[PDB]
Structures are given as C-alpha cells and as structure tokens.
Design a protein around this ligand. Structure first.
Ligand code: 1LI
Length: 379
C-alpha cells in the first residue's frame, strides 16, 4: 500500500486504463495498459502510425535477447513480437526494479488504438494463459519473486465523473497491499476458482430486484472472469438476452433503436436530462468464501451506460460466446483486491463510486444460496 500510488492510472473512456512504466537503462518511459485478462507484458518496439514512441532495445544496456518469437491474439486486436528481458520499474508503484520478460512488438493489427496514449500492455493474470506457453513468467510473478512485494494488488478504476474528445478517466493500482482510504464498508471475497484468468463464480443475477431464475451454470457458461482489459460487462448468450429483455421493460416509457441495445449505436438526451431512474440496477451475486454463502455487487446505469463524444451514451453490456466478462464498467465504482496469496478477489464500495440521489453501487452480504460449486463449468 502507498499514498504515492493513488491516481497512478489514466485512460480514455472505452480504451482501458494505463500506468506509467520504464523499461531499459537508461529508463525509457512508456504508458502501459493494465490488463487482468491476459498474462503477457508487451510493448510497441517498432514504428506504428498510432504510436508516438516505443521501446528501442538497442538503446538499453541491460537488454538481453531471448532469441524466441511470441504472438498473442486478443478478442480482435493482435500482435507479433520478440522476447527478451530488461529492467522494469513503475515510477508511481513500488520503489523497486525487476528483470521481467518483455515481448517487443514488431507487427500488430487492430491492437494499438488511435489517441489512446498507451504503448504497451501489462498482463496481470497467471502463467497458464501466457504465450507462447506457461514457462514465460508473467511480470507480477517476477516482481514478487525478485522483491519482498506481497503477492497482492488492488485496482480502483474510476468513471469519467470533454465535448468532441473521449472523456478522460482515472484510477489507482495499489501494488502489494490494500489501501483502506480507497473504499468504504466491508470487503467481501469470492474465491479464485482457478489460477489462469481471474476466474470466479456467479451464483445469482437480479435486475431491479428480480431474479433471472436461470440455472446458475448459465451465468458461468464457459467461465466467469474479472478482466480490466475488456470495457463492457459481457454476458453469455442466454443471460444477455434475458438481461436486455428486462432492462428494456424497466425503461419502456422511452424507446431506443435496436442499434443502442446492440452496443454499437449511441443514444442521447439534452444535457443533464439523462433519465437514470428508468434504467434498473443489476446485482451479480458471487460465491462466498463459505459454502452456501454469497454476496452481491450492485451496478447502476451510470456504470453500464458509457459516455462518448458529442450527453451521449453507448450500452456497455454485450453478448459473449466465451463466458461472463466482468469488464471495466463493472469494476468502476468498486475497489477490487486481487489477493493472489489467498486465492480470492475482494470487492468493496469505492470512494469514487457513482453516488446518485436515491440509489448507489453496493457490496452486500451474506446471502444464503444452497449449492454453488455446481454453478461451475467442469473442464
Ligand atoms: C478487448 C480485449 O481484447 N481486451 C484484452 C486486452 C486488450 C485491450 C485493448 F485496449 C486492446 C487489445 F487489443 C487488447 C483482454 O486481454 C481480453 N481478455 C480476454 C481474452 C480474449 C482473447 C484472448 C485472450 C488471451 C490474451 C488470454 C489469449 C484473452 C477476453 C475474453 C475472456 C478471456 C479474457
């Protein structure tokens, strides 16, 4: 924990959160997307039209070629690179330096985003999903192994709160501890089912207090994960359809185009007249540390209606064919502790949550649910 790590994240709405890092000797400054949905540390290392700077290995005295190729395909972006090791620091993180594996990006497609202000990505998940394979020690594992930094990190992603520019966002990545000033109320923990993605189990879903009443295996159909690198709440097909049906009904007083519900087309209102009260709250109940217990995290429309350029919003809930992805919009307004040491993820109401006059984002428990290990997908 540390006061000096507060507000060390920045970003543009919809384009992830990044932290400043240095690579090489002398230190080369780069902005790096913080991604709990992947396990590779990678940086642009060759010219690209959307990169204004990049990692130049030749300028680093501490660089070492691993003489090995590496490739990672994400949801739609992808890159190819060359492995190596170098000294890495996080100026606004812990006061330490570590020799980490680095994928030097030489080719890419739809990976770098025009005007995002980041030049690389920091995969914070486990070795099991790293490319080329699990022998390439992820950054966080190197940090804990080489230093005395406790095996734990927390993320406080904050919302937007202009005009023709994407809203700027901020947050905090607290490495090695829990900063108690970043949250209120109690921290509730859900088990990390398996150490590969940050996998969890959802046992119940409600929209405005109404249970979807689905077999809980559906909520984790495939898998459920906590992914700071994906913007939206992504839901498996059957859950998505049931959720949008209910959100439509709650906000039936008004009518929006199908494009809006499909996440692509935007929807606007005059400034300050956004009818937040017609959109329902969504509660995801996560499995507790104790069998038969659960806790819920409640999400407001201020989280799932993401603001965009020129008051305009996009529906930030979309369909998945690879499980539930609790992306940035779900993490916003919560303090999320990735307690790797004790294989669990904690949630607490964030100090930067969306107040709202009548409703608020919340973390509450316990709630007693008969049977929860049966909600998982058995390999
Ligand atoms: C939108 C997106 O692609 N986000 C990625 C980071 C990112 C951010 C960005 F701004 C631009 C990019 F090109 C990439 C996440 O890593 C996605 N994470 C999952 C995933 C999807 C596809 C392969 C993979 C890996 C890297 C593990 C093979 C992991 C998502 C589905 C559930 C599993 C996790």
């Amino acid at each position: 924990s540390f006061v000096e790590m507060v507000d060390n994240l920045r970003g543009k709405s919809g384009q992830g959160y990044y932290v400043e890092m240095t690579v090489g000797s002398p230190p080369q400054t780069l902005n790096i997307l913080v991604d709990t949905g992947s396990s590779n540390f990678a940086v642009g290392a060759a010219p690209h039209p959307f990169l204004h700077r990049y990692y130049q290995r030749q300028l680093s005295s501490t660089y070492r070629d691993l003489r090995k190729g590496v490739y990672v395909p994400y949801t739609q972006g992808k890159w190819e690179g060359e492995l190596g090791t170098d000294l890495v620091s996080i100026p606004h993180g812990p006061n330490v330096t570590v020799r980490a594996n680095i994928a030097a990006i030489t080719e890419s497609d739809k990976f770098f985003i025009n005007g995002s202000n980041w030049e690389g990505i920091l995969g914070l998940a486990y070795a099991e999903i790293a490319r080329p394979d699990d022998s390439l020690e992820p950054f966080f594992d190197s940090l804990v192994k080489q230093t005395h930094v406790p095996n734990l990190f927390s993320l406080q992603l904050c919302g937007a709160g202009q005009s023709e520019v994407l809203a700027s966002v901020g947050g905090s990545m607290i490495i090695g501890g829990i900063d108690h000033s970043l949250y209120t109320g109690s921290l509730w923990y859900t088990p990390i089912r398996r150490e590969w993605y940050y996998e969890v189990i959802i046992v119940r879903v409600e929209i405005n207090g109404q249970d979807l009443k689905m077999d809980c295996k559906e909520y984790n159909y495939d898998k459920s994960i906590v992914d700071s690198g994906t913007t939206n709440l992504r839901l498996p097909k059957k859950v998505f359809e049931a959720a949008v049906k209910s959100i439509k009904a709650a906000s039936s007083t008004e009518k929006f185009p199908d494009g809006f519900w499909l996440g692509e087309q935007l929807v606007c209102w005059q400034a300050g007249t956004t009818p937040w009260n017609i959109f329902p709250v969504i509660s995801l109940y996560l499995m507790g540390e104790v069998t038969n217990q659960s806790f819920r995290i409640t999400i407001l429309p201020q989280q799932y209606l993401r603001p965009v350029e020129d008051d305009c919003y996009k529906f930030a809930i979309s369909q998945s064919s690879t499980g539930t992805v609790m992306g940035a919009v779900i993490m916003e307004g919560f303090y999320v502790v990735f307690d790797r040491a004790r294989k669990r993820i904690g949630f607490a109401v964030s100090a930067c949550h969306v107040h709202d006059e009548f409703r608020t984002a919340a973390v509450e428990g316990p709630f007693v649910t008969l049977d929860m290990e049966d909600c998982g997908y058995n390999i």
